Symmetry: D5
Subunit: 173 residues, 10 copies
């Protein structure tokens, strides 16, 4: 069970969550162990949560390692399409490269475009919301990347972070 | 529940099995529906299957549309890796292009290089087995392609065909 | 022997038709039974249609699978050129990557460049009407794509959509 | 409603037909008046022909200009795949670059690799029968190309050649 | 003997001339034959023409098939250069693709970038004039393309159309 | 602090590749924590280590992360060249791409890499030794990759294996 | 090693003219440059950056003009692959153009690297932090030194200082 | 009027014209002036000669500068095809790159292939006969390259050289 | 031996680009013979020349042939960089591709090269000065190309023009 | 400068072992390397090659490890663009691998540059004639010197000698 804070959303949708706050949310998403089964569980957990909060809306979910090995992929409602896979690669590439969520990086972009800010092709990179690194307690560097696509940007980002914290907080057992 | 005919596996392993036989199995793997949910059901079904039959073998499972859109992906156990992804892409590519299992296609060709017989890169197309198209009842053209990787090629292929036909065989 | 609602064609040209209504029309373009023969019937059928409603106009008509395999291609009158082939590629490539027709996607774009909104090379992808997905009843995913080029963008779209829906009543 | 000389088809398969005789046959494949409508008539005509002489065989049939613009494409039966599209490309690309059919050029090659004799990427160019230039009376240079794929190489060639010559008598 | 209507040139220069006018001239440039010799005759004819009308202007003249095969090339005077070749390739490319003079195509589009209106590179396609297709009497599709370079674009185009029609106008 | 086992080096240097053993050696190389400081402490540790054992021979040490981010790079004497960069890159990519070390994978083949066995281009992927994955007690996937270049491939590998297991314990 | 806050602001304000920059830059050189020199140089810059910038992830690189990499390290957590891209893009500028990244950024002024200098922005950075290590007895650089993660002017000044400060041995 | 020495041919066709002899033929092909008109004249001269010696055989003739600017191109009998243009570029590239005729270089190849002898792609290069540099009295470096394609290799090479010497020897006026 | 004409340099350095004059200056640069020795004598001649006039400034001189074969290359002081290679390459390609010098062509444009005026990529082709075609009394096409880099573009061009006409006469 | 015909045959016969090669090679170095040094070196090698090889077109190149070209010339008529390709392909080997082209050719033995060393033959030559100019006071080369057109072993030996012979000034 995952609930999206609605005032945190819309305070995202309307901008003006400070970067240092965003980074604080992100750094809260970390896991103790990361196991092939962990990836499956978390992936399905997110899939269920998205189906719950957003019925009838198609969403693609991805968990991949920093080298690209894909562990989990699903599609939630089936209005999805190949373009989802492009967003997934594109957001994921940003998150893995810069070490922050792809929402955060869009925020640090503001206006001014990926090309002239970070000197990267925007066909390759995607500064919209859905990518969030899966952090590791004890590793200083991410286990993997979690990526959501097909909701409004702020939702993709908040679903990832929320699910990632909710999940991590059920290993309170 | 999916059990592999041990007879058929050893046959396949020895390349004992004629193309018209191959195609006949493959022509049997078909669904009347294929929704986004069918995808997820089918993928976890196989995931269970591979893990019951081959515990402690890391195996990669894909379901994609012919256009490349990935509906489902999973890893069956620890010790999977990149190059499971390459193999999945390379098998799938061969299967969707040629209209038969990547395994059938390896049966065809045998001992000639891919570059020689089909005029293809082989860094690009894989001719080992494990990629089985998902056929549609109402259409001459496949719904999707199911691709397994990480077992022996005859097993990646068998697991594919068996569980695909097993899954198809559950309906009311 | 099909008819284009002059009012509708106009309701498109001024972009007065909301997305959910475009999807309405589109979702209704689907067939039971897609085969090689349905492809050819549909193509001949649209060929004739366009020729009867647009007699001196050089139109290109294509039917292709989501993996790009081409079932049907023709030109209607004598003024077609290689550029049509590019338009068909570009239009079809959009319809398949995105859930919807190239016209629907043209609309979702507005005055922003494809590069800017959807982040694609516009040399690679078209946003102009005339590519329409052929839906499967009970599959969630399209059988194939239908693409028309050389009429006015709103006419390309509507001839495609009208033809599928009309062809769909070929039920005997 | 056309007929393949069983003896001739055999005289091809064993390569007993000298080049100048292949050119003989070929030089005789030509039309007065090439239009959009002749393209479609020729394509439908060959479609029917192949279907009547090869009923369960999945054949792809193409007509394209020398600049690549495609006038006609179809598949005959239900087993065609993207690989056919590649064969058509590759066969057609040879016929156009070189003065002659892809079969004629296959013959001129023998056991040498295309890379070795003609110095081309065989992934790019086919030497297998089934691409035949549509000649112009009084032009020195072909109207367009005709390509057939999916029969046996010698059958692909001969159906194309037989069809052009036979179609050519459509004179009224 | 080829004289340019000085009226028509100044018109063209001022973009005074409607597309249907343009196409009408262009539709008139056609041969009943086009042999290898026709090519050489036509090319030297133009070569003479450009050099009588524009002495001491270096001008490049091409005749190629739509497939890229060069039948004829010459340089009319000293001070020609590479980039005459680029211009020739770029004009020819536009013309063969779009089915009209490279000049017509520049009339169409005017003030929009090529990338904007036709979705093309423009390092690749040129929209200045001077490339005129050579039409065939018996065919909807062009024999070849004639391309001139090194004058004012309206002249490269005019010289092209005039001498093409003049040449066509000599027969017994 | 870390010492080679010349006997095992012998077994490596010819035939004893049983791969259960090579795997068992590799699964044995892991850290409980991985930090920026950890990567510098280890890279330094291995520098000193090869400078003791192989005093006069130029050798390159690198630790990077599965996504290619390079945390540490050094070299132990003059006469190292750009070709070391290519070796590191090349054998790292192998180790990162397959589940295993380079040299485990080299052992797993007596054939052409460029499309006999694994269908990858040899120019891109190196099947000699020197790349070893740093593992994670808590994860079934690796922290980073350690790669050494410029000794014999067996020695490149063993130093990597030995120094990792060493650094781990003490 | 500590950065002169006046200089650093002068850099930031872009009131330090090219000849001065050149002068500071021309001043960074060595008598010996060896495999060990490089280590000595690299480490020494590392704790320096740790000292002056305790919270900040920073990647430090010493490479030869042919690309062969002698030293690489990161000073703290929070480093990413984009650091590597900056090291490449800044260093490429210095080795190609004969001055520091910072220098060329000044010389660039408001214009785009494509329009001035005619190069790809994606491939060539002008932010400073790359500073050519120089040789006495030679007209041409030993190697390049590159620092990234400190924003712009302190990337450059930390580099230049610790080169001079190392050069007095 | 150009006559192909038949014993020189066939002593070409069968190999065993020494390289140093070939080079001697080649160095005989040079011009005093090279003018746009010269290119046209020589190009047509060759075209006529080929039509004479080889009626009914299609041959493509090319004269280009070392930077690639094409001055003359024709096609003799019209059985020609695009593949001619490929041979023309390919042979021409060899001649211009190595400074000898493309026949000579095929001879210096012998067996053993362009790839492992000269480290060049043979799709790009073409060590068959028809390319011959147009030399300059006083320039030490070629005016241009002359290229013939579509006869037997030795013929392409001998037609070029013969025509190039015949032509140069009519400026004996 | 060769001296600049600071007055013409003035006319160049701003407005006097009439192009008939620039062409007339260029047609004037030719040699009656061109040899391997000629190319070395000239390259040396120009080295000395700029070392006199512009004593302390780094400058690169190159003569190559229309097909890109490089006969002579030098540089006149320290502080020349790889970027000089790119300039030489870039402005040579322009001069070799169009009928004219770079700077004649630069004058012929107040617009974007990369596809406003000439449709070529600026990264590939340089429209500043310093490239001048060496001509041939006997041919309507050029022997080779002379290109100088590292002064102001006007000076790069004039040195090239002046030294060529000089070398020609004496 | 004149080539020892015994040595040259030893090179040709491939009886000179790597450590020896290294030794000759390690022996070629300089105290100063400047823009003028490079000219002095380059010209000096040119007449040398003219002397020992009066009929033979030969291209001589001095380049920095980043590719920046200080000296280029040809010694006679009969040069071609393929000389330039050899200069590139040989020099690329030397700068990448830390030894001479000739050296690496020996170390290559009968195997293909693809199968040993894992590189493109089209991009990397092993024929010798490229010889790294070395620095005293440094572990890493000043620049590369490359000679082409003399076949194989005399390309290499002319290079090595005239480096040593120049190094005694």
């Amino acid at each position: 069970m995952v609930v999206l804070d609605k005032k945190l959303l819309e305070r995202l949708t309307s901008r003006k969550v400070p970067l240092e706050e965003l980074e604080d949310m992100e750094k809260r998403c970390f896991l103790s162990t990361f196991t092939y089964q962990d990836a499956f569980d978390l992936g399905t957990y997110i899939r269920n949560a998205v189906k719950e909060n957003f019925p009838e809306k198609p969403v693609a979910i991805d968990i991949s390692l920093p080298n690209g090995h894909c562990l989990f992929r699903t599609v939630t409602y089936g209005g999805s399409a190949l373009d989802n896979d492009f967003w997934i690669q594109r957001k994921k590439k940003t998150a893995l490269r810069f070490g922050h969520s792809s929402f955060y990086m869009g925020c640090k972009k503001g206006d001014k475009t990926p090309e002239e800010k970070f000197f990267v092709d925007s066909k390759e990179y995607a500064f919209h919301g859905g990518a969030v690194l899966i952090q590791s307690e004890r590793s200083d560097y991410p286990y993997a990347c979690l990526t959501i696509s097909g909701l409004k940007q702020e939702e993709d980002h908040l679903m990832a972070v929320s699910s990632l914290i909710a999940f991590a907080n059920e290993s309170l057992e």
